[PDB]
Design a protein around this ligand. Structure first.
Ligand SMILES: [Zn+2]
Lengths: 99, 52, 190, 131, 198, 156
RNA sequence: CUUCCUAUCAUUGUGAAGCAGAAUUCACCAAGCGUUGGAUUGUUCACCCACUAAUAGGGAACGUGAGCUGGGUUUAGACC
RNA sequence: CGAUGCCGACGCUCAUCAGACCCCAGAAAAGGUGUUGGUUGAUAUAGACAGCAGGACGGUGGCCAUGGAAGUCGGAAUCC
């Protein structure tokens, strides 16, 4: 037969080798595209997650029922000591892929 | 405000058409066969009904 | 079936020189040059006479659908003759019954912004094809003018701004407004 | 503008909430929240300041035994403002209203959540104290 | 063409030449259906008018057979739509009374304009109406001295210009035309003695 | 005249029906008059056989509705036991209303239509402009279309 | 609890009206995405109260009992 | 997959669902100025079909129906 009552699905199939990661740290899978007008600059950093804490700020979204009032907003604290550059790598485009 | 000539100029593009009774296409005013292959170039055509 | 020959001749004016590399007719007149590529169309083109008096197209052994292109090759060249000597003007009028169409030519010949159409707050901007210049008519209160030396780019670029102002979800035979082509002439005519 | 930032819905269908005005009712019996599209096998829930249909189960014989629109004033489930204070009153509450959005009675006892007073101005006219 | 229609065409023209003593070659140039009705209404009081599509061509087959001789002097002169009028009238009356009428016939849509009209800033006749039909193409005209007065005086009317559906209509109520030819005569047939208007 | 008696050259003419009895148009004299400030009052004066429809040309020289019954014979032939409905009188006459001589008056006054040779061609028109008995008794025009030369020069 | 179909209830793009606007009806490419909470009955089905953009129809051994429930059929006890 | 790796013969067909072999697992009534043949009647040098050159003409909303009908429910009628 058909399902008696319709229903939305559980979970998402777009994430479906649901298993332990081979890595331990994040592996950025696609870096932002370079607009060669801009002066050279890095793209990504490497930080450590410390904990969480509050914050209090104003807000100036025009039209919101929360305009020009306090809001409290849960935040993290990602401690980020300066890294150290040690090596350079060059990549060449190949019809197969990147080398 | 719309003028005499302009209205009949507008009626040329929106109001003087031939319609195909099997697929509801919008043919050019002197056609006796439809244009689309999803009804088979049928020749059952009627003028697009002009307003009151 | 299988007609042994059906040809056509293009008498071209004496102010024009036309050259053709096999099937890439290049026409040059008082206003500029035009290049058109007739490939995958299978017609042999010839050119006869001093000053290039006449262009002669040819077509051997052609069935019906393959025959009716001998004139189409001829007919486009006429538009490449006329478009380069005279130059096309496509006059087009703005019909409005709600309240004014506010068209302003933001640049030389492109970005034809169309405000207050049907009362909308959207600024419908349209970019003309290369080499087609749009000007708001000094001659009449509500007309644009598209001048260009190629019918396909001139005529298409008119259909955009006509089609880019379309009433939606309303009785079309009642909401008669927009921008609709009126006159299809030349730059110098008589 | 029309902001109604999510507040923890705490009265599912079946909630019996004390009436809070002088119409003479004493219990609203929620039947269905108004504006909820729902999912398979989930009771609709009515927050604070949400129009919700209700059938008076104890009070004036005129009112009982028919469906009257209602608005939930005070809810017992601790809901969060958008500044981190979790306000929660002492009892469930409500008030009869027309579907045009204006009261039937003319005297509300007890406080009114600030969420309602921002939404239904007619209720905020008669509110004793917008807590 | 048909057969009976063709034999009737043979029958109608052949009688009218015999019925009225002589017949004139009058130019029946482009003119309205009712506008050329009046051409037949004016010219008939004691005369017969006839327009022929294939009656007029028997001149060739007759000229070879030399009846009412020398039609070869008149066969290829009928380029353009000139015509015959079967009358008991004379050479000067046919010419002048058809000149006098000078029909301002209504034109056609999509035509060409070899003939021009000057457009002065005065009144020629424009009754109860709105200038908006002129305001369509940018011409703005005021109302004074009775009819609507077109204040423009520049040569709006040129040679070979395109005429739209509404364009001939404007010249109709102004009663001006880009085809102002009227009715023109220069050729006469008088019982075998060919003449020109006297 | 139409909106508010605009400043113009009004000499308007319209094709109006139903003289005498009102008919189902529920109007006799005006078609564009009353909104033009030109009263239909004087058009009603002419409105007051034929108990039946006509065609009326009405003239309005800026202030005056001078209604004129057109001199077309058919409009006058009819106007001169009750003439009840659903007839069907074959065709509209009694058979003895002297059709051949009502049309004498018309031939001498109708001079605004239908190209005329000698008056043997107006007689073709005004016997065919008729619809009372359709060209006295019921022989319709069938071979009477050549008399413009053989009964015109012998008409007077 | 998963998937699939389209002969489409709503959503994106569009065609037509006896289409002024609002609501609507006929149709096209179209299955990505949704199609509910309950009283009564074992119920599939049905009929109702309420909200909703709509509360469209179906298939997979009339899906699914070493997945459950056993309410009713359909053993043995009984009563009319 | 053994055999056309013949410089095989004449043709027909564009499919945004092509078609591809007895029993056989390839649907119809009906349509298509898609395309290629056939049959029949015409018209063209008393010259064609187009397009340029004029248009639904006027007495006339004929007379009537009155059901409102100047081309319209519908009328013996319905011509010049
Ligand atoms: Zn079709």
């Amino acid at each position: 037969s058909h399902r008696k009552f319709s229903a939305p699905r559980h979970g998402s199939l777009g994430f479906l080798p649901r298993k332990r990661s081979s890595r331990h740290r994040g592996k950025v899978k696609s870096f932002p595209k370079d607009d060669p007008s801009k002066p050279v600059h890095l793209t990504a950093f490497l930080g450590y997650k410390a904990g969480m804490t509050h914050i209090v700020r104003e807000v100036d979204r025009p039209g919101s029922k929360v305009n020009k009032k306090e809001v409290v907003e849960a935040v993290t604290i990602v401690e980020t000591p300066p890294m150290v550059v040690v090596g350079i790598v060059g990549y060449v485009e190949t019809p197969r892929g990147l080398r | 405000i719309i003028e005499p000539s302009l209205r009949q100029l507008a009626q040329k593009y929106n109001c003087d058409k031939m319609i195909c009774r099997k697929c509801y296409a919008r043919l050019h005013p002197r056609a006796v066969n439809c244009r689309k292959k999803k009804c088979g170039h049928t020749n059952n055509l009627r003028p697009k009904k002009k307003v009151k | 079936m299988k007609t042994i020959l059906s040809n056509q001749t293009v008498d071209i004016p004496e102010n024009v020189d036309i050259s053709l590399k096999g099937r890439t007719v290049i026409v040059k007149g008082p206003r500029g040059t035009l290049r058109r590529d007739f490939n995958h169309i299978n017609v042999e083109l010839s050119l006869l006479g001093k000053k290039k008096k006449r262009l002669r197209v040819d077509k051997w052994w052609g069935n019906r659908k393959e025959l009716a292109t001998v004139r189409t090759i001829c007919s486009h060249v006429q538009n490449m003759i006329k478009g380069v000597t005279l130059g096309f003007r496509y006059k087009m009028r703005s019909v409005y019954a709600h309240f004014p169409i506010n068209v302003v030519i933001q640049e030389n010949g492109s970005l034809v912004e169309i405000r207050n159409f049907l009362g909308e707050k959207y600024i419908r901007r349209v970019r003309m094809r290369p080499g087609v210049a749009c000007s708001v008519s000094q001659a009449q209160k509500d007309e644009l003018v598209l001048e260009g030396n190629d019918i396909e780019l001139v005529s298409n670029s008119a259909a955009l701004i006509q089609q880019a102002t379309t009433v939606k979800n309303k009785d079309i035979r009642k909401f008669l407004d927009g921008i609709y082509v009126s006159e299809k002439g030349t730059v110098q005519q008589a | 503008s029309g902001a109604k930032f999510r507040i923890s819905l705490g009265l599912p269908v079946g909630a019996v909430i004390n009436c809070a005005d002088n119409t003479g009712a004493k219990n609203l019996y929620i039947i269905s929240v108004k504006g909820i599209k729902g999912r398979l096998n989930r009771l609709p829930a009515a927050g604070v300041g949400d129009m919700v249909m209700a059938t008076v189960k104890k009070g004036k014989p005129e009112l009982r035994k028919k469906v009257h629109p209602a608005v939930v004033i005070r809810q017992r489930k601790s809901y969060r403002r958008k500044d981190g204070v979790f306000l929660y009153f002492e009892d469930n509450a409500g008030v009869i209203v027309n579907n045009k959005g204006e009261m039937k009675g003319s005297a509300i006892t007890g406080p009114v959540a600030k969420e309602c007073a921002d939404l239904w101005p007619r209720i905020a006219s008669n509110a004793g104290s917008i807590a | 063409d048909r057969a009976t229609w063709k034999s009737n065409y043979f029958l109608k023209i052949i009688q009218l030449l015999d019925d009225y003593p002589k017949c004139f070659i009058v130019g029946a140039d482009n003119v309205g259906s009712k506008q050329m009705q009046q051409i037949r209404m004016s010219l008939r009081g004691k005369a017969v008018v006839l327009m022929g599509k294939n009656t007029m061509m028997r001149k060739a087959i007759r000229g070879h057979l030399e009846n009412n001789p020398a039609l070869e002097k008149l066969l290829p002169h009928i380029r353009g739509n000139v015509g015959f009028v079967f009358t008991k009238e004379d050479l000067t009356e046919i010419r002048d009374m058809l000149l006098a009428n000078k029909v301002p016939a209504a034109a056609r849509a999509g035509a060409i304009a070899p003939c021009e009209v000057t457009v002065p800033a005065q009144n020629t006749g424009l009754g109860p109406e709105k200038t908006s039909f002129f305001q369509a193409l940018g011409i703005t005209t005021k109302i004074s001295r009775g009819t609507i007065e077109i204040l423009s005086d520049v040569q709006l009317i040129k040679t070979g210009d395109k005429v739209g559906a509404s364009e001939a209509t404007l010249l109709n109520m102004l009663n001006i035309s880009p085809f102002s030819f009227g009715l023109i005569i220069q050729q006469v047939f008088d019982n075998g003695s060919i003449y020109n208007p006297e | 005249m139409p909106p508010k008696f605009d400043p113009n050259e009004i000499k308007v003419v319209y094709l109006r029906c139903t003289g005498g009895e009102v008919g189902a148009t529920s109007a006799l004299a005006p078609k564009i008059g009353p909104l033009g400030l030109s009263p239909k009052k004087v058009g009603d004066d002419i409105a007051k056989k034929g108990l039946r429809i006509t065609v009326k040309l009405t003239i309005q020289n800026r202030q005056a509705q001078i209604e004129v019954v057109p001199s077309a014979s058919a409009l006058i032939i009819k106007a001169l036991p009750p003439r009840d409905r659903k007839k069907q009188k074959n065709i509209k006459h009694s058979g003895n209303i002297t059709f051949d001589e009502i049309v004498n008056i018309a031939r001498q006054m109708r001079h605004r239509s239908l190209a005329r040779e000698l008056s043997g061609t107006i007689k073709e028109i005004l016997g065919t402009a008729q619809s009372v008995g359709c060209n006295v008794d019921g022989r319709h025009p069938h071979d009477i279309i050549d008399d413009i030369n053989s009964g015109a020069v012998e008409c007077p």
